[PDB]
Amino acid sequence: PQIKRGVSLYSFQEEFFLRKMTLEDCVAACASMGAYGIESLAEQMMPGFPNLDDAFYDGWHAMMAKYGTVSVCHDMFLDTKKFRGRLMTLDEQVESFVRDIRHASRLGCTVIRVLNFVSPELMEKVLPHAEQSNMRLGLEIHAPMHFEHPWVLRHIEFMDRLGSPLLGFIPDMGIFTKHFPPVMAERLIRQGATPHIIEYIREQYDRRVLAEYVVGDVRNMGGNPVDIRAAEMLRHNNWSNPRRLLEHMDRIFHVHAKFYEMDEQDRETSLGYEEVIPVLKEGGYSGYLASEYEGNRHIQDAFEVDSVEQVRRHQRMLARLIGE
């Protein structure tokens, strides 16, 4: 009974993009589902960030109390390629990261989703700023990465030497992609892929065949450019060992409950929710699972998008797997 339910407002991007839901609309939808933990994207739905004034932040505090919701997680971005022809200096990046540390401190959050591509070296240099705001840094682990990828392994080295409890991870359920996601495949065929070639690809995905064999194999059997792009998605979606989570539980601050499609059965159709949640229980996890709906970008060409409904089903499913 220690797993808590939350939602990343990223889940409602389609309605927000179209101005169908305001920011407060999104939080309101969240409490109506009993998802009181909030994960937010400042660069997405608070225009004027990083120049939000005390009037905004106090108002955010007042909103949280009205809905009984809790500001759990802030999701940072790092535009290292902001300047054409060069990358940011390490010193320029720390400044961008501190923006996000300050804002998360000012937002009432307890953890920041640090983008997966963030270097061990940048994490080390900004750690003192995190310490000053007692702010946790959770590195997102997303496909094709996993807790045993050498990039994460190198991060583990840094956190092992430094020994700070503010450094950690946010597993994203796309590293537990059990089947090739249906809504992706359906759009690929809509984009002109060979349905027979899609069927081979999906079959081979379940078999765990190396991505590069599948690429050449689809190539060799006469696949078109869309088929090739379909096959190459096997480099971007992976299964990983759910029991590996038990080894790192102290560093799992937060979880991206990514999902693409909840069917009429309150079942997620391609991700390994039924395997990961039992393990988190075995390990004593006491953080949040935050719905992170990404199906919108795949279905929007041919279907109306309903992120709220989709999140209602995901939240009902999370409750089921949690045991509430």
**What is the smallest separation between the CB atom of 235 and a second copy, expressed in angstroms?**
7
Q: Which does 83 bind (CB under 5 to 8 A by kind): other proteins, a second copy, none?
A: other proteins
Say if residues 189 and 229 touch (Cβ distance below 8 Å): no
Site residues (vs other proteins, CB under 8 A): 10, 13-14, 16-19, 41, 43-45, 47, 49, 77-84, 115-117, 210, 212-213, 215-217, 296-297, 300-301
* Residue 75 known to bind ligand: no
Sheet holding 37-40, edge to edge: 167-171, 136-141, 111-114, 70-75, 37-40, 4-8, 288-293, 255-259
User: CA triplet 79, 84, 87: central angle to 5 degrees?
Assistant: 50
What percentage of the chain's residues is helix, strand, coil (to nearest 5)? 50, 15, 35
Say if residues 176 and 258 touch (Cβ distance below 8 Å): no
Among 154, 190, 219, 316, binds a second copy (CB under 8 A): 154
**What is the smallest separation between the CB atom of 201 and other proteins, expressed in angstroms?**
14
252 makes contact with a second copy (CB under 8 A): no
**What is the smallest separation between the CB atom of 171 and other proteins, expressed in angstroms?**
17
Q: What letter would DSSP give residue 81?
A: T
Say if residues 287 and 235 touch (Cβ distance below 8 Å): no
* Residue 306 known to bind ligand: no
163: left (phi over 0), alpha (psi -120 to 50) or beta: left
Q: What is the distance between the alpha carbons of residues 93 and 81, in angstroms, rounded to a whole number?
A: 10
**What is the smallest separation between the CB atom of 55 and other proteins, expressed in angstroms?**
19
User: Which span (95-103, 131-139, 208-216, 293-301) binds a second copy, by CB under 8 A?
Assistant: 208-216
207 makes contact with a second copy (CB under 8 A): yes
**What is the smallest separation between the CB atom of 250 and a second copy, expressed in angstroms?**
17
117 makes contact with a second copy (CB under 8 A): yes
What amino acid occupies position 141? I
- Residue 41 CB contacts under 8 Å (≥ 6 apart), including other chains: 8, 9, 10, 75
Among 25, 151, 281, 297, binds a second copy (CB under 8 A): 151
**Binding site residue list for Mn(2+):** 140, 172, 256, 292
Q: Which residues bind a second copy (CB under 8 A)?
A: 117, 119, 144-146, 148-151, 153-154, 207-210, 212-213, 235, 238-241, 244
**Binding site residue list:** 140, 172, 256, 292
